[PDB]
């Protein structure tokens, strides 16, 4: 039973909203409402728009039919859980596209692929698409589309503690990420109609698969500090980032996908609050399952005593904060020149959200102390 894509591959009614694909605060939920929750074609349409903008369809002679069929199957694979659904995959794909394509102040540029929304005439800006080969960029985009495939709505710790079959299968080593990559590649290789990489040679296909698997496995938060330390050590080196080195480019792509996977706190207030609501709903479901199983309820997963503000503040200060700081210090953070200083929307939004959470925590503590 092959899950073939709907006959209209391109939806014209979305052509307006896709025009806002060039801004960081993309109204993705409005796109979900426009497309419809039943069909769930958001990821396929967004991926098609991004591939057209890059031109990877003509660069690699990618067949449209196979690409659309496989991405529709990938959309179907995502479960209807509050956070790790196809909406999150679309958001991560849009974020990696934004990070790779949008101008970066002071980034020197060296086949290669450039977005149609980038101005090559200007010499004061650069983009990661001008330093990363097209094959690696396509691998990064595909991995971002596959980063959380078939997510069960549970964390790695819950699966390990409960001795879930997935945990036993992968020997309690990056259970979620390994499962996502394995399921995505099994789906890709299961049907001939999903093979949109038929025009790649044997060596290129192997390299693409390796890059996609590495990028997917980089999304694990258990190894987050390892990646952060490695990236900081590479950047602080006098040599710096070498774009002619395969390992350095792989590390840069892994950092980009890691930053895009937790980009929620770095958005505007409305998107950040909606993503926080989704993730805390998923946490509450996991905590209810833990209570049913008799295990002690994990922190922040108790619906009776929510700690949403504390969770968000800790996540921003410990996970998102250092990662964004390292990415900006490396010089890969998109921004604009102000007249010379650099203005970044992502960093400003992260600071504003962190201040909001600190204010909420202080207000809650004051209210508790009064009572």
């Amino acid at each position: 039973k092959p899950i073939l894509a709907p006959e209209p591959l391109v939806m014209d009614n979305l052509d307006s909203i896709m025009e806002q694909l060039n801004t960081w605060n993309f109204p993705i939920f409005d796109l979900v409402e426009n497309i419809g929750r039943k069909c769930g074609r958001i990821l396929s349409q967004v991926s098609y728009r991004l591939f057209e903008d890059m031109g990877l369809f003509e660069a690699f002679k990618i067949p449209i039919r196979e690409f659309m069929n496989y991405f529709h199957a990938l959309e179907i694979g995502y479960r209807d859980i509050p956070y790790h659904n196809r909406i999150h995959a679309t958001d991560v794909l849009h974020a990696v596209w934004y990070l790779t394509t949008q101008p970066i102040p002071g980034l020197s540029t060296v086949g290669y692929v450039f977005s149609k929304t980038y101005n090559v005439t200007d010499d004061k800006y650069g983009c990661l698409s001008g330093n990363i080969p097209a094959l690696e960029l396509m691998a990064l985009y595909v991995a971002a589309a596959m980063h959380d495939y078939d997510h069960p709505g549970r964390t790695n710790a819950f699966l390990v503690a409960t001795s879930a079959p997935q945990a036993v299968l992968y020997n309690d080593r990056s259970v979620l990420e390994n499962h996502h990559a394995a399921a995505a590649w099994n789906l890709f290789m299961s049907r001939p109609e999903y093979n949109f990489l038929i025009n790649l040679d044997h060596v290129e296909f192997k390299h693409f698969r390796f890059l996609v698997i590495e990028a997917i496995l980089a999304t694990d938060l258990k190894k987050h500090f390892d990646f952060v330390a490695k990236f900081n050590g590479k950047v602080n080196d006098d040599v710096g980032i070498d774009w002619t080195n395969e390992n350095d480019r792989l590390l840069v792509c892994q950092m980009c996908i890691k930053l895009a996977d937790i980009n929620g706190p770095a958005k505007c207030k409305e998107l950040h609050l909606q993503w926080t609501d989704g993730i805390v709903n998923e946490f509450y479901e996991q905590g209810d399952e833990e209570a049913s199983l008799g295990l002690p309820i994990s922190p922040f997963m108790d619906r009776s005593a929510p700690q949403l503000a504390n969770l968000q503040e800790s996540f921003i200060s410990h996970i998102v904060g250092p990662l964004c700081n390292s990415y900006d210090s490396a010089g890969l953070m998109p921004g604009k020149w102000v007249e010379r200083k650099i203005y970044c929307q992502i960093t400003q939004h992260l600071l504003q959200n962190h201040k909001m959470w600190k204010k909420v925590i202080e207000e809650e503590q004051r209210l508790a102390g009064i009572e």
């Binding site: 964390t155 790695n156 390990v160 987050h224 994990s298 922190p299 922040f300 504390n310």
Partner: protein
């Protein structure tokens, strides 16, 4: 003659070096050069001990009268010694004339790019700089010892027939000269000094005295570089002169040479321990058919490992005593590589609920602090590895950017004084921060002692900051680096349980 001052109010090691003359003019005009050298040696030893023991103060009684530090200074020899010990004097040393005493505040030695873990006045390892025997500096000694440790210690080749001259020619000529049964007076040598040849002339009366003094350093240099030959009894122009002596004098000199060589410390990095292979010979000098004197020829073979002229001159402070580091310890150091936050939450809540006045006292004390972190413990002395004092209710450490760290001791006993306990705890905390913690800046720890009355009355029995004075550099500290050093020290002391409020919940969820 260096003693640890136990009567000082400072929360650090204070070493008393006795009366020291200060001032450039005063020191350059000292009639007794022996006394000046002794004072310089005492100051240098105290500075080395403080550098190796976590920093402290050197207190010296100003011997000369009417001495003003601003008008007179310190002294050229003392400054030269400090420069020899430390690459950057202002980074480690502060000077203060307090009344009749002179205080040298010494920061702890910190590991740097040079790789040195300790400071040494003199490694007493000698090498051959083509013609001279020089004592290896800290970097040279470090390189030599590491190279020997890495390798567990340390025929002819056909060449074109070309008339060339090398050091091997001098070595061969010296070896031939060594095997001569007798020598003729006023004959010129065919060789000169080189990496393997040293030639010295000594008087008969001073020969015995100088054998015990200068022979060890030349023997160490030869055994460390390539071995060689030492010839005593030849003047500057390489003419054979010798020294007049009897057979009994020759036997006594040979015994003295043997004792001096066997006294030399030796460290082995190899499996097979070996002695210093040396051969001493006396060659008669004949002038007009009569015996004039004797020439002493000493052949020192190349040694497998380090040879010391004396024990390495490195010092530290242990058990409140200034002790010179043993050779094994010195070798091991050289060759072997290395608002307001209230934490922990549970302990703070328990202390505030059990004692109501404690919270009010803490609030009153912290109202004057712009930003900092306050860490509570049942006994900070235990966390530093010292003995527990059950009379102390709790201890509090305050780390702020505008002020040096302050340790708050609280007690319920009205008629007992806890000055010594708090001072020792602060001293140990400073030492742990400097050495184990890794803090690389000048740091001092103040103490405040409070009595908690059962009715809630709080009184400040002892305030260290109002009774001691430091250079201004000690009053400004880096809060983030202090917290990092404290975290590292607590982790290495196996006493880090809940001092830092890490997001355990978040890491538990993630699985880290």
């Amino acid at each position: 003659n260096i003693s640890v001052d136990l009567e000082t109010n400072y929360a650090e090691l204070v070493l008393d070096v006795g009366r020291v003359t200060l001032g450039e003019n005063s020191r350059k005009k000292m009639k007794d050069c022996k006394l000046r050298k002794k004072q310089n040696e005492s100051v240098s030893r105290a500075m080395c001990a403080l550098l190796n023991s976590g920093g402290g103060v050197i207190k010296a009684e100003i011997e000369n009268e009417d001495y003003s530090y601003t008008k007179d200074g310190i002294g050229l020899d003392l400054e030269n010694s400090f420069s020899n010990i430390l690459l950057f004097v202002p980074e480690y040393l502060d000077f203060m004339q307090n009344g009749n005493y002179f205080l040298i505040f010494v920061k702890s030695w910190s590991l740097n790019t040079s790789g040195l873990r300790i400071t040494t006045l003199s490694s007493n390892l000698y090498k051959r700089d083509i013609t001279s025997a020089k004592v290896m500096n800290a970097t040279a000694a470090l390189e030599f010892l590491k190279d020997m440790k890495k390798t567990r210690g340390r025929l002819l080749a056909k060449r074109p027939c070309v008339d060339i001259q090398e050091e091997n020619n001098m070595k061969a000529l010296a070896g031939v000269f060594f095997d001569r049964t007798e020598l003729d007076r006023k004959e010129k040598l065919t060789f000169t000094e080189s990496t393997h040849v040293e030639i010295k002339n000594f008087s008969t009366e001073k020969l015995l005295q100088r054998i015990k003094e200068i022979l060890p350093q030349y023997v160490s240099a030869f055994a460390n570089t390539d071995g060689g030959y030492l010839f005593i009894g030849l003047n500057e122009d390489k003419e054979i002169i010798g020294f007049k002596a009897e057979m009994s004098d020759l036997d006594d000199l040979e015994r003295e040479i043997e004792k001096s060589i066997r006294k030399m410390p030796v460290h082995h990095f190899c499996m097979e321990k070996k002695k210093i292979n040396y051969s001493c010979k006396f060659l008669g000098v004949y002038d007009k058919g009569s015996l004039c004197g004797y020439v002493c020829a000493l052949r020192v073979e190349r040694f497998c490992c380090a040879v010391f002229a004396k024990e390495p001159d490195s010092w530290h402070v242990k058990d409140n005593r200034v002790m010179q580091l043993t050779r094994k310890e010195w070798i091991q150091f050289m060759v072997e590589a290395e608002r307001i936050t209230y934490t922990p939450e549970n302990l703070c809540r328990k202390l505030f609920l059990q004692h109501e006045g404690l919270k009010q006292l803490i609030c009153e004390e912290m109202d004057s602090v712009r930003k900092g972190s306050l860490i509570f413990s049942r006994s900070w002395s235990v966390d530093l590895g010292l003995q527990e004092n059950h009379k102390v209710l709790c201890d509090a450490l305050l780390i702020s950017q505008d002020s040096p760290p302050v340790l708050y001791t609280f007690h319920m006993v009205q008629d007992e004084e806890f000055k010594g306990y708090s001072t020792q705890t602060a001293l140990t905390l400073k030492q742990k921060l400097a050495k184990i913690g890794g803090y690389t800046k000048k740091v001092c720890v103040m103490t405040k002692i409070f009595y908690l009355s059962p009715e809630g009355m709080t009184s400040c029995q002892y305030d260290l900051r109002s009774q001691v004075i430091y250079p201004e550099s000690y009053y400004f500290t880096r809060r983030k680096y202090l917290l990092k050093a404290l975290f590292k020290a607590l982790k290495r002391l196996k006493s880090l349980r809940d001092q830092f409020s890490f997001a355990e919940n978040l890491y538990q969820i993630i699985g880290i």
